[PDB]
């Protein structure tokens, strides 16, 4: 959802302060009659502050739509507030401040940035300066990739020198969980953004072969492989085009990591490269479909001889 | 309930302060002997400090009393402490305690306000002002009419430029719940006691025709509409007339707002102005129920088509 | 879903009987390899007996799928026994089992069924001829539309001399429950299938506008009145006119009562007499959504005068 | 265990009938005091019948002992009936009563075939004949091998015209559950004792390769395919091996089925080939750790491709 | 408590049978006001049949008593029925019915009867000889005296060739529960009434010596053995006195069984051979507190390095 | 466990300061692959610190391992900083702090101590001094053996002038729970390291020989006693026996106080000397199963004749 669906800017000395929303003046605002000159300007409810402007109605569960996100909830308290403290640690400027809420972020990557921040153990709970880089990153106001440290987060399941793997935990959100039971994908994020050793990739190779061999290695070209059933990869493939298809209308650029292309799955390299190379989506989605039959052979027979011993 | 029933007045330096009771000597009191003199006096149980006048024990729930309110409830506690920070904020002096602890005030309306007060949300939460404003209005120790952001609270249910329609709780309250689980009543009031142009009220009037087509839109005067089941609008004017003939033979001033013509339903408009100019109960509540066949045409139609599309 | 998905033939003696099908059997299925040309075929679960065709997996809800039926439910074996006993009624011959098996059927209606067959205080229980009756009208192989004594079932919320209202009790099915829940839909049958007088007319209009105001008055054509939300008569359009259409060009009959134009909403009665007169969906749904401004005028008056009275 | 934990034999009529034991009559046999010439005999507890002989009190659980049975279960007296009436079927004499219960049974079998039997939906519960030979292979008194219809049961998870594939249910037994919570095994019954076509082979070996590609393709030799974790066939090749050492030294034959080479896990191929060539354990286990780098290539990329269509 | 406390005599055809209580009518009893003439003979409550005669109040435990049984419980119906079948077996003639309702039975005796019966794996179940023959020596209507197979019951903690150990019950009992929680008893039967070889008491000495160090091995004369705490013996020599002494009195025979003197407590053996002598309860109770310091030596230490190994 | 499996080392100004770990570090480094020569130093986990070098996982519960601990628990965390208070009491330098981590503990001391500190009642937590030494003493960095007021702790069941008896409360830990039910095990400690008069050995060997006769009084040798079952005593043996046979094999010093021969048990007695006289483990574990047959005679029997009386 938008940036506005959970702050709403307040001008303090030449600088904005971001104020998070009250879920009562949400309420509010749901069952308000507008104008049609006023849906994309912040409501007034009298009693609980200031409310999203009634354009993101759509944003919002109400026992018409299970399609937004949960704003009754804690979680969307912690995540706004989590919004705000990154944007007031930049200085938006009049000029900046409607793009910047503007900015479309993804929900489920905030709250696991909650869940970090809130953990003890975490390092994001005892670094404001991470917490914030991490944030800054999740919505998109960073030149930074998304890296380990600095990661979403999640559940480690695998990790060595280069990598570590996180299970998403989607279906355990309190803000805005996914819905299909069926659902599991996992991320690979780099330890380091630098150049990595032949043995760290085998390592993560020979653990995605074995341990998620139902899975497809792709990525939306930010940095990080994400692990996704097959049975869903031509759906990733459809917002990974739309997403490139907009940043060349609206002029914003493509910059697209293709990412290790001994990791990457053959089908999704492929995909990804012609999409860079300007085709049409018909033409290197096909790409994803057609049994390219064409590394690190026996991979796969070490670790099963490995589990065959011990 | 009489404000005695929440706290009795301690003189100091000249300027009257108002405790509340303790619910345990509340208890005693219900189980004391008394003279009849000493009915109207404020009790002494010896161990839990002053309690109301044996003569209110009517107005606490016992096992033989199920139309009174339940004071060994926190609530009450909490109700009483509003009651006080009001009544402190004035400086009631001598000759005029016993006439504002003989005040009737809705223990419903006081309890909602303890629920907006305790609300971090609420306006009311945050502003001492705008809480004691509200109490005061409450307690009928204040000029000014109920308005939205000093209102009794609820659910908001409606709300638009000019209005604000609330669902009453009571069925959920702890210190005077209303028993009968069929009850359901509105609110509407103004968000600014103001001239309100004819769009606004045709947004209100459609709402109130779509979504409450078997509610009457009533008013007891002071300033805001009460939707109201047509099944019983009738005790509605009982009580309503009740209060207009006390204050005419008790010699206080009648004030009714009979609010607009266009929102309240015809016959209670008819009833109401009847009573203005001075008829017996028989000849305007007759009003009620005869069918006068005689705005805004076609309301109902332009929103049912709304929801035809969509 | 088609009637094979409950019962698979079994021929004897020149007369088919048909055998419902154990959930275990339909379990198997789901997990089988089966060749392209055995898609259409009956299955053989080695141990749980005949299975429906593998075409039909779409039918049963898996952790894929949660647009099928609930299968492994005991509504599932109940629903297939009371599609059994009226297959069996009939002495379908060889060139009409796979028509029969053929024919797609609401299942929710064979639920409510089997829930009033199974009270002892409903009709259904005492006579196998009316059970039979309506059970053969549910499944399309019956001359007559459905009335009272024969309907579908739920909640009488409303009954006079000419006509039942039923609420529709699909939130609570086992084995098919439709899942939104902020679903209500009514069913007015006629008692007796005969000439009306105006009186008991006025007495359904009344309570429907009263009572049901937010609720389109239709039908589907089959001799009863389906209360249905407004804001999903649209969708009820686009059904009514697929089948509509798929029997023009199927070539088999299609009648459609309009039934009575006093109860009927106007719009849906301009919008189906549009559709039995030839037109394109686009031409006669556009009814549908135009405002036509222009019987028994203050109806809606007296209901309320009732109220406000008593 | 031994036959002899579930029933005592009772001669009637020149052939014998064998009778459950009481759980109670166990219970108080782990309780007594025994001389050592009548650890072999059956025990008189005087208030609940026989019970098993003293030398077996290894094989229930006692607070002592959780490598044994529950005995007390519900399920431990339909295991023993259905031992019963496999052995009433047949008319042991009195030469072989102490070998037919001296036969060591899988308890864990005996319950999966008392899940079946009181199945209606199963075959089991319809033909005491197919039941009955059902449980004499299971008691190894029988010639036949394990197939579909007469097999231990559990879930099933595949099937084609060929095959069935069963879940091993052990960790929701009632008599013997398997303790380790991480167990998971697989079992591929024959559906009918026949040469089976290549397609279906490859249909088997393109699931077991796709959906089980952590899991060995193993067997005992008895017929059917057992899907066993990498890091357990170990533990199978020391009781296969164990088993097939036995015969050799106790005279009784060795008849070991290899199954299809194209589908058991190829070092399961060469230990057991190796195994029944005659070479000692360390000989052909040694085939099992190491790794034989050489059908039916491009079958899980077939699959593969088939998830990233629809 | 009294036999007359569970049934009433009922004379047919010169032939005595005994009819259980309804709860209800002893509850009528107990709210009764009766004469003291009265007070012996059977109570007609007019609803719920024949009731104990009021003498009897104290033995039904009521708000004001906790010392008497659970007479609204299922058990006391199946205790009294149990006691009617036994005297049913009998044909009590007119001169024998108030003696046969005046023996004092021990309720708890007739519980674990009960318990046996109803336990399809007790030859009980299944013996109406040995169940009456049980219930008879129960009730002190027959010759025999309790070995295990109609002993009173429990759980079972050793057997050997000659003897059964039970753990009374008595703390889990519906009808006459004992309420000290730290209560424990033990009760060694003899399997056949005949004499014993010494190693079968060996057995029985050294598990007595080795598992219950902190029990005293005693008897009330009447053939078995019972294994009480050394606390408790003090109260057990009272109570065997009481009952020694009132059999002098009363004229009946004094049959003592002093049992096995290897077994018995040194102490006890004493005190109940000098009470058979004829001795005052001072004398020979003093025998029970004096320490006398003089079989089978190195039992003890056997059993123990038994356990030192296995 | 090792010290190294709570807290890794920090130096500080020449002198170490030890870490504890963070619970979901560990959990990290589960699921790391790590080189052969870095499994013994400590693990990265970039998101929660520093973990334990991964040639320690077998010390952690997985799914894989239930012989670990359950680090995942609060009582980890509260006894890896019990560790670090002790340590960091120290000022370890650099050449001993691998020794000083390499030091195996009793994981369940550790908690019983933790226990101790956080109840208000206990010395320990009034006395960091007190609190400090009994960790020592518990991590072998202490030279003063374990007497009462530093003890393990438990529930007291006996106390004298001289003794205090602990049961261990081992099956209801947190950290490491035993998971044999049947276990129990108890343990005297000396009040001070001093002699004791023979009253007091009198006092504490007549309550082992009457409460405890089912049990060992052994010794490990480092100064207080130890009450174990008879069966278990074979296995403590073996314990005691491998840990002297280490330090003679070490070099480091092995001091093994018997205690007092008249309250060891005699074999064990015999079993520690001769081991103590550097024979080997056949010659003295043989003396564990051979009778000895040949202190306090009539102890046993002075108890019991207390408990007749009173
Ligand atoms: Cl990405
Ligand atoms: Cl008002
Ligand atoms: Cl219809
Ligand atoms: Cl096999
Ligand atoms: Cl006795
Ligand atoms: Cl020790």
Chains 1, 2, 3, 4, 5, 6 share one sequence.
């Not at 308000?32 to 569960?61: C, E, H, L, T, W």
């Not at 990153?137 to 600095?150: F, L």
């Not at 993560?204 to 097959?230: M, P």
């Amino acid at each position: 959802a938008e940036l506005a669906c959970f702050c709403y800017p307040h001008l303090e000395n030449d600088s904005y302060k971001f104020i998070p929303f009250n879920n009562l003046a949400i309420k509010a605002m749901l069952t308000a009659k507008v104008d049609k000159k006023d849906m994309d300007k912040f409501y007034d409810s009298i009693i609980y502050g200031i409310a999203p402007p009634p354009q993101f109605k759509k944003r919002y569960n109400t026992n018409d739509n299970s399609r937004g996100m949960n704003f009754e909830t804690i979680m969307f308290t912690k995540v706004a507030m989590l919004i705000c403290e990154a944007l007031n640690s930049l200085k938006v400027t009049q000029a900046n401040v409607s793009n910047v809420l503007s900015r479309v972020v993804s929900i489920r990557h905030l709250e696991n940035l909650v869940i970090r921040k809130e953990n003890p153990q975490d390092i994001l709970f005892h670094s404001k300066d991470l917490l914030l880089k991490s944030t800054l990153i999740a919505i998109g106001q960073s030149k930074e990739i998304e890296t380990t440290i600095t990661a979403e987060g999640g559940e480690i399941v695998f990790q060595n020198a280069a990598f570590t793997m996180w299970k998403l935990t989607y279906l355990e959100h309190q803000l805005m969980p996914i819905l299909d039971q069926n659902f599991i994908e996992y991320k690979v994020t780099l330890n380091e953004d630098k150049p990595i050793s032949d043995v760290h990739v085998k390592e993560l190779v020979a653990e995605l072969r074995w341990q998620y061999n139902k899975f497809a290695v792709i990525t939306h070209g930010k940095g990080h492989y994400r692990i996704v059933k097959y049975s869903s990869v031509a759906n990733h493939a459809d917002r990974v085009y739309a997403t490139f298809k907009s940043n060349v209308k609206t002029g914003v650029n493509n910059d697209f990591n293709l990412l290790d292309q001994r990791i990457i799955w053959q089908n999704w390299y492929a995909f990804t490269s012609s999409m860079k190379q300007g085709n049409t989506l018909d033409v290197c989605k096909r790409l994803l479909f057609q049994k390219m039959k064409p590394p690190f052979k026996g991979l796969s027979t070490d670790r099963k001889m490995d589990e065959v011993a011990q």
